[PDB]
Design a protein around this ligand. Structure first.
Ligand SMILES: Nc1ncnc2c1ncn2[C@@H]1O[C@H](COP(=O)(O)OP(=O)(O)O)[C@@H](O)[C@H]1O
Ligand code: VO4
Ligand SMILES: [Mg+2]
Lengths: 817, 125, 45
């Protein structure tokens, strides 16, 4: 099932491109020319179908063509339709005959949908569209991810013989990391449940596999054991995806030229703070909460006083169970993973003691009372008093100091300090903001504990980046959480479109190769209505928060008048005062602007921060490590949204400096079913990942864009006599390398500062390089061992006089007996 | 006196006097003489490697007439590589050394050839 | 499964690679007695 607004977007994106030539030279129809069409009752009666394969009847009509439905089978009734709804179709072409989408004769919307339809359903999810690679979510393991396949792509010589896969990319990324000595980055793109998190793991498992077994896997151990903990703590069950990433994951890894991760740095950002406190129906909280209140041992069930999964206010009691998920078995694996992260049993117990404390504090009921003089002044319940006292001793904090910052209103003006009392709703917020900060700082403390052991001393030089973000997510009700997620996705896209198209277009032109233009759709307008400083949905939110007399309703109005033009901002038809729509790359998304200012502000007070910093427990102190204790009005750098965008901004430039690689994950259906094709949902994703737009890049011809220097480092072994040749110039060096290896004048091209080469002759040079690489892989390894040999020999030679005393005293002992 | 008495000496070093050497250290040991097997031949090797098997493998696979044949590449042999550019190939490819790299060049001595390196390594062994 | 769709690469022994269903992408050689002519341009519908 797919929603009408999804259908709305899916319908609009289709467009007639290339004219149909289903007519013979004389003036009659061919022997049944087949064409795709959007007109047929099967398309009307079913959402999943947008186009049917119809064959033109042997009759006539050149002006208003006659057709019969063939795929799927129809009534066999000959119906007439307009040629504007006729798209050219390839019939002789086999979908499993080739990997690159750009190899089709007709590359129109339905022709690409079908080429991907027959690949997915025959269980070949990976399809290239160079530089891009399309991975459709199969929803079932095909075994193509196992160690056997890793080893194949790893030890296989010719890249040409190998079929499209996440490993094809993982190897070509690592082929440049060591080939030219440039930092590379892998980017998993796609909507909520497309397969980003899973694909990251596969490419991580690829780098984990080493050719030669002589490596220190102690660092590589914590790196891999972190992921099932990061999914327990950071991932939660949603209606869109049951393992939905509520945090953004970014890695930096130093991998060996044979394989295996030497060092790493997992840097996680923006954790869905609201998911801890409140969860929607059929939607579940972070896996670790349910894992710990199911799989905990009898000792932790009495020491912490653990209750059932339903008994907690911070946990949805009806959504408690997930299909195909055994939170007990996952917990077993989580505990061992914590051990592998060099955490002691004492360090692990405290991690769960804080989690037990968070859960317990949530259950405590704050009620109204006739105190302070202004009434409604909150009070901790008499029966829930012992519940609160146990929770504060579970999180290792002073139970009277935490009670004071939540119940007593501490406000300091100028010099004179003023004492009061917080109201019922206000104290519930202080209780909630405390649980939110304890969980987020703990989750990030595990990241810090990991990075403490896995990080390289003296940073990274030539590392491998990997970016697992939260994909586009649309629900019935979308809020600030959903706003920040969809912003991330649009940001990743802006930088994608720039690198892949805008930069490449300028590169070929500046080098003096192709003056031709690249046609593509950018989010330039929609990214600015959200991220352009001064004039954007994010900047107007910050202005409303920093302003004292600013409301949630005043914010919508602030956007509606300023961001009126450019279309990308459209205020809601229903309750415009509290709702607004954004024209995303996935279509229109409506956000209920309720609590937008409150959510953006939610970051724990300096008053409670001091209590957690003064803790008698070391782990509890280390949570708020070097944290600015702030009192009064919230600063622009303390505001969640402002703190989010600046973190995102910095991360993008870090990625722009490297050589990115794109993985475009497609979610075929919402029903979460294998071998189920839904043309609307897929088409939107074919646009939103710019798969159809990536076809224009065929025009370039050349599949190698590197400077004379970059060519001379990766390739010089072909003939080191003309490569090291100091007299001849570098422009003349590169061309002579191709002369010895032998090339036709069509494969290579001069270039101003760059060296342009078509993929056609690329592998021909790479294999000629490998023929001189292997004879030098062993030549290096023989001399390298012949010295390694004499290192032990010379070290032994100095110990010979000391051994001559052991033996002389042994001979002495043999004389006595 | 001959290779037979020198092979045994080399095992007790790479094994660190162990009876059963680890597969990875056995490859260091064979290479230290001038022995490299094909992808197939390197799979034909036993699970647990011992002194008795090592010495049989030594006789069969070691080059005697020209101890280091594998160093010779005649396009790479006659050619002269500068000391700095040579270390460039070494530092990127390296699977062993750390600072014993400076000591290899001392075993040879600005522009060097592979026939010079092999000749010096024949006297090293 | 009794039969797989394969493809000759580059003879008394064919350099075939499994295409339908997708395989390891390994080019293996087999006897022509186990090679049956296949229609490719032909649509089943
Ligand atoms: N390569 C794959 N093979 C099989 N199933 C997959 C694959 N990738 C993803 N899935 C399925 O998709 C679900 C969600 O995947 P995930 O990567 O966590 O998505 P997201 O990008 O939303 O975090 C998994 O639970 C699994 O069933
Ligand atoms: O479900 V997601 O991990 O794509 O947010
Ligand atoms: Mg993802």
């Amino acid at each position: 099932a797919v929603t009408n607004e999804e259908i709305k977007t899916a319908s609009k994106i289709v467009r007639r491109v290339s004219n149909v030539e289903a007519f013979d030279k004389s003036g009659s129809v061919f022997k049944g020319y087949q064409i795709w069409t959007d007109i047929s009752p099967t398309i009307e009666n079913d959402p999943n179908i947008m186009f049917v394969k119809c064959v033109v009847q042997q009759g006539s009509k050149k002006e208003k063509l006659t057709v019969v439905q063939i795929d799927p089978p129809g009534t066999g009734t000959p119906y007439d339709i307009d040629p504007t709804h006729a798209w050219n179709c390839n019939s002789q072409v086999d979908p499993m005959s080739f990997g690159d989408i750009g190899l089709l004769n007709h590359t129109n919307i339905p022709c690409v949908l079908d080429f991907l339809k027959h690949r997915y359903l025959k269980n070949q999810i990976y399809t290239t569209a160079v530089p891009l690679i399309v991975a459709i979510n199969p929803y079932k393991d095909l075994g193509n991810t196992t160690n056997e396949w890793i080893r194949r792509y790893r030890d296989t010589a010719d890249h040409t013989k190998l079929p499209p896969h996440v490993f094809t990319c993982a190897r070509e990324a690592l082929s440049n990391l060591h080939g030219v000595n440039k930092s590379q980055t892998i980017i998993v793109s796609g909507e909520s449940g497309a397969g980003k998190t899973e694909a990251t793991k596969q490419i991580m498992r690829y780098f984990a596999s080493s050719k030669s077994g002589n490596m220190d896997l102690r660092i590589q151990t914590a790196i891999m054991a972190a992921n099932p903990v990061l999914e327990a703590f950071g991932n939660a069950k949603t209606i869109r995806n049951n393992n939905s990433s509520r945090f953004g994951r970014f890695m930096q890894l130093v991998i060996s030229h044979e394989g295996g991760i030497r060092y790493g740095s997992v840097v996680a950002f923006l954790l869905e703070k609201s998911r801890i406190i409140t969860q929607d129906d059929n939607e579940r909280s972070y896996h670790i909460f349910y894992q710990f209140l199911k799989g905990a041992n009898s000792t932790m069930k009495s020491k912490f006083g653990l209750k059932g999964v339903t008994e907690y206010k911070l946990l949805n009691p009806n959504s408690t169970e997930v299909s195909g998920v055994d939170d007990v078995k996952d917990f077993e694996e989580v505990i061992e993973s914590l051990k592998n992260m060099e955490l002691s049993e004492s360090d692990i117990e405290v991690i769960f003691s804080i989690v037990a404390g968070i859960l317990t504090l949530g259950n405590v009921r704050l009620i109204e009372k006739q105190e302070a003089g202004l009434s409604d002044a909150a009070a901790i319940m008499d029966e829930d008093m012992g519940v609160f006292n146990k929770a504060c001793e579970l999180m290792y904090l002073d139970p009277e100091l935490i009670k004071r910052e939540i119940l007593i209103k501490v406000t300091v003006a100028g010099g004179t300090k003023i004492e009061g009392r917080w109201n019922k709703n206000d104290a519930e917020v202080l209780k909630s903001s405390l649980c939110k900060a304890m969980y987020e700082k703990l989750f990030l403390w595990i990241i810090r504990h990991l990075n403490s052991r896995i990080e390289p001393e003296g940073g990274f030089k030539t590392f491998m980046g990997m970016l697992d973000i939260f994909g586009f997510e649309v629900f019935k009700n979308n809020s600030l959480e959903q706003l920040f997620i969809n912003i991330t996705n649009e940001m990743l896209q802006k930088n994608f479109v720039d690198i892949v198209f805008e930069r490449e277009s300028k590169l070929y032109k500046d080098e003096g190769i192709s003056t031709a233009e690249l046609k593509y759709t950018s989010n330039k307008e929609v990214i600015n209505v959200l991220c352009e400083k001064g004039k954007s949905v994010l900047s107007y939110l910050e202005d409303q928060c920093l302003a004292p007399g600013g409301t949630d309703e005043k914010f919508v109005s602030s956007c509606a008048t300023n961001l009126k033009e450019n279309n990308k901002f459209t205020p809601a038809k229903v309750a415009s005062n509290k709702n607004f729509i954004i024209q995303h790359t996935i279509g229109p998304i409506q956000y209920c602007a309720e609590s937008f200012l409150l959510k953006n502000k939610d970051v724990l007070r300096g008053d409670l921060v001091e209590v957690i910093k003064d803790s008698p427990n070391p782990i509890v102190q280390q949570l708020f490590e070097g944290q600015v204790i702030e009192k009064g009005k919230i600063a622009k750098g303390s505001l969640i949204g402002s703190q989010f965008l600046n973190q995102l901004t910095s991360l993008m430039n870090l990625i722009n400096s490297t050589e990115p690689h794109f993985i475009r994950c497609i979610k075929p259906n919402e029903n979460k079913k294998p071998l189920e094709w839904c043309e609307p949902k897929i088409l939107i994703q074919l646009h939103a990942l710019s798969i159809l737009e990536a076809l224009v890049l065929r025009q370039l011809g050349y599949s190698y864009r590197r400077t004379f220097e970059e060519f001379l480092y990766q390739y010089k072994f072909v003939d080191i006599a003309a490569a090291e040749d100091s007299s001849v110039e570098n422009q003349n060096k590169c061309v002579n390398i191709l002369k010895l290896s032998g090339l036709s004048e069509s494969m290579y091209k001069i270039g101003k500062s760059m060296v342009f080469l078509k993929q056609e002759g690329a592998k021909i040079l790479t294999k000629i390089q490998r023929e001189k690489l292997v004879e030098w892989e062993n030549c290096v390894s023989v001399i390298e061992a012949a010295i390694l040999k004499h290192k032990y020999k010379q070290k032994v030679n100095k110990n010979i006089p000391s051994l001559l005393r052991v033996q002389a005293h042994i001979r002495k002992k043999m004389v006595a007996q | 006196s001959d290779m037979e008495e020198k092979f045994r000496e080399a095992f007790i070093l790479f094994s660190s006097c162990s009876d059963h050497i680890e597969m990875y250290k056995f490859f260091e040991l064979m290479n230290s003489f001038g022995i490299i097997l094909t992808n197939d031949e390197k799979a034909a090797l036993p699970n647990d490697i011992n002194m008795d098997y090592w010495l049989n493998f030594a006789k069969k696979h070691y080059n005697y007439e020209q101890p280091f044949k594998h160093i010779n590449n005649e396009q790479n042999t006659n050619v002269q590589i500068k000391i700095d550019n040579f270390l460039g190939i070494m530092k990127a490819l390296d699977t062993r050394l750390t600072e014993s790299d400076l000591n290899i060049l001392l075993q040879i001595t600005s522009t060097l050839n592979l026939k010079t390196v092999s000749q010096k390594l024949t006297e090293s062994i």
